[PDB]
């Protein structure tokens, strides 16, 4: 009740983590149409490198998802203290195999353990991944499109099905797309190749694609589209597959459930979601 | 003597037209229709009661002349079934879909017991069929794409899938040309949502205006095919292949007793001689 | 027991129609390997197109259906006679100036009037005919495609070139056939049916000669017939996607005493290998 | 206490192989296999009695070595489940299909109680599942097209559907491909039954014929990819998107017991990585 501790992640355009100044406050960033942009103070590690033990001083968080969190707080009368993920991996069903037990990681593990539970982040909607936690109604849909360097038909293409040495394609490590590529027994020949290359976050894949590497890249639709929008050097190709939608998460029968879905459905109508999509997505250079 | 009915129609060429009323007022080769721009049944009732009286005080702006294919077909049903009718136009005129729990427009006015019939270009589908009653179809339709002068592969064209390069387009708001897209293809719904049009003539005028604001279009095949073949330059055209065919029909209340006869009558005119006649009489003008 | 009298129609390469030579004895032909062929005596309307009923001296018939019927009659020891259809249409439904029944013509009319026992011919077994008369299980499968002059290109039925009714691309199909009834019942596009009605040919052979000359630019008929009559004469090439897969059957009366053994014999021949023997003999490749 | 059960297996590459036995008569990582091309069970009984007899058994022609995927898979399963096994290369080598009543090949042998264990690249079909029972699949694969080098999209292209005067196909005589093709469209069933091959490890030399016989070898993807890899000259490759996704599975007698234990063992082995180990042990990648 009352105080809720929430977990987020770093990926454009959902939550930037730009550091603050020495005093502690966050500088006033400006939006397109003459308004202040809401931002919160979010604590977390200082990435794998640098720092003392990855317990750095707070940073600033502001983007799409944070607006939804603030709207939920306004419509629910509750207070929050947002903190970042310890590792950064989205979280997939993993086996330690030292005790023949299945254990999660990242957001999923930090939700099931119980030290933080609102997961306000664009996770995924998945059949078996959400089989013992309760999702909510999606606030945005997407597909699994593929980005390439400045063409590929899709998942049915003999370059994708068999490389030899110079058409390597990878995805982010330990995430949702890995679950669906592993589960399909029909499509399981490529996954072994994908075990060779897999990056920790999206920025590494960006730098690989830009710097004459990673001939292909598979990720969510919205992130890829915004990526190809702002960065005018890579363009997407290939028709969509795995049509699904993002969503907020809660532990099994947490005592909010219903009101979250009601607020999501109400804000799906009127002008809230459209305003958010207009002000935080696209506005492209083409 | 005879049954008395109230019937609601829309304004969509070439199925139904709108011609200015004459000075004395007779609507030659047509009937008289009213449009007070409201969804309130009570107002409509008092307006109709005042109109058919010994001293009517109604605004001139409310009276228009209505005629066309659909109206002629309604006239034959009126002749065959021996009932008199009054005609009026939807309060807002946006077909009907789900919005804030309740229905809207044509479907909403049918459900709220305002008019006993709904005869117009009316695409029937699962959402509307389970709430109200529909008769046998009298037309087969499709969905097509309209593009101005100066090329698509259908519906799976990569140009209208990946919104990296700035494209355009969007169906008319709150119709069956978007309910199918929204329900069976949800990812490209917001993109169509930012670029939509209130009425089909407004959309086709937006496409045909410099600078190009909303390239491409999605709507019913028949309306687009009529609209392309009335311009002089004859530059617009239809691209793609047919998809998501539903078929038209006449709107009816929640299974009123008269739901059975009308279906067999429409079947009879469809079989014997009427559909061909009536279709050839309005789909005219030479293609350029 | 009883002398079943048969009725077929002129359709190559399933049956051949060749005139009787001199006194009446049939000309003795031969195959490539020297195997003799068998022919039968047929008393049909020899004179001309269905106008005057002049001299009807019997001619010789043979082909694919005739061999199958010879095999059928060799078993269960029943003797037969064969004669062609007076009209020459594939048993469709039509009305008259005093339409109150909408009965059949051609083969269906001839068999439903109680003077025919068997119809050995390549006729499609669709739903309506199966309702009015009972068939047997098919002995050959087909899917109707189209052909064109060999460019000295089209893909399917949904190609936009063939949809709109043009004047420089006139096409049609032989009238009163399976194609016409199946396209009439199916709604899809009534304008398609209206455009077909303009130049529906009278016979299944004159249309091929016309498309070979220059007259019409698309013939829509069954698979095997078009394929054989195209690959046999090096002037026509077919292009399509084989829509409406169906089969050919044998239709006796409404449960005649001969119905139970026809299916048994046809499956015994289908599985034993007789079908290969007939198919390789009467359907081969010569041009390529 | 010790349960003895027989095993039926074909000769299909990767999944199965063969080798001529040594003079002494041993096979490392493999068991001696007989060659009884007879369907009757009593001969198999006396042959196995001679196999376990003190007196000398059938000469070398009824003996061979073996090694492969399912061979070692079944070796470990039998080691876990405490039983031995014996193998022989069926009598027909024709998988199984419905023909003249009783089935053929593996299905006919199993329904006839000649064996209780069927391990091969056995496909999954609903029609076979009606009579015989299946376990949890331990693999999944699709169908492809083999063509010599120097753009067949698959089955939905006009190049293959209608006969373009000189295009030929062919699969195994009665494999799972034949049944799927027959249930989908029988005209192509007849077309390939004109040129269908009896077994897979023959079609490849047709492609070495400067092919006038065969130009397509639609079959399972695993053997197709292996034959691609073994192609040192690299004059061939698989084309077309996958269709008819299928799965494999160990065959069992109808309503036979102990299937739950085998399915659970297969699931546990797949989870623990035995399947991956054997996959990388046998299925090899070669750049071509």
Numbering used by the authors:
A (entry chain C): 395 to 544, 663 to 798
B (entry chain B), D (entry chain D): 511 to 660, 776 to 913
C (entry chain A): 395 to 546, 663 to 798
What text appears in the publication on this structure?
N-methyl-d-aspartate (NMDA) receptors (NMDARs) are ionotropic glutamate receptors (iGluRs) that mediate most of the excitatory neurotransmission in mammalian brains. NMDARs are formed from two obligate GluN1 subunits and two of any GluN2(A-D) or GluN3(A-B) subunits. The GluN1-3 (A or B) NMDAR emerges as an exception, distinguished by its distinctive ion channel activation mechanism, which relies exclusively on glycine and does not involve glutamate. In these NMDARs, glycine binding to GluN3 promotes channel opening, whereas glycine binding to GluN1 triggers rapid desensitization.
Several key differences emerged within the LBD heterotetramer layer when comparing the glycine- and CNQX-bound structures. First, we observe closure of the GluN1a and GluN3A LBD bi-lobes. Specifically, the glycine-bound GluN1a and GluN3A LBDs are closed by 25.2° and 7.4° compared to the CNQX-bound form, respectively. The degree of observed domain closure is consistent with previous studies on the isolated LBDs, which demonstrate that agonists stabilize a close-cleft LBD conformation. This suggests that our structure represents a glycine-bound configuration, although we cannot explicitly identify density for glycine in our reconstruction. The GluN1a-3A heterodimer interface is disrupted in LBDs due to ~80° clockwise rotation of the GluN3A subunits compared to the CNQX-bound structure. Specifically, two residues, GluN3A His787 and Glu812 around helix G′, are solvent-exposed in the CNQX-bound conformation, whereas they are proximal to the GluN1a residues around helix I, Glu751 and Arg755, to form the inter-subunit interface. For example, GluN3A His787 forms a polar interaction with GluN1a Gly750, and GluN3A Glu812 forms an electrostatic interaction with GluN1a Arg755 (right). However, when glycine is applied to GluN1a-3A NMDAR harboring either the GluN3A His787Trp or Glu812Arg mutation, we observe no evidence of channel desensitization. This result implies that destabilization of the unique GluN1a-3A subunit interface in the glycine-bound condition disfavors the process of desensitization and that the unique subunit arrangement of the glycine-bound GluN1a-3A NMDAR likely represents desensitization. Therefore, we speculate that glycine binding to GluN1a destabilizes the dimer of heterodimer interface, thus facilitating the rotation of the GluN3A LBD to avoid steric hindrance.
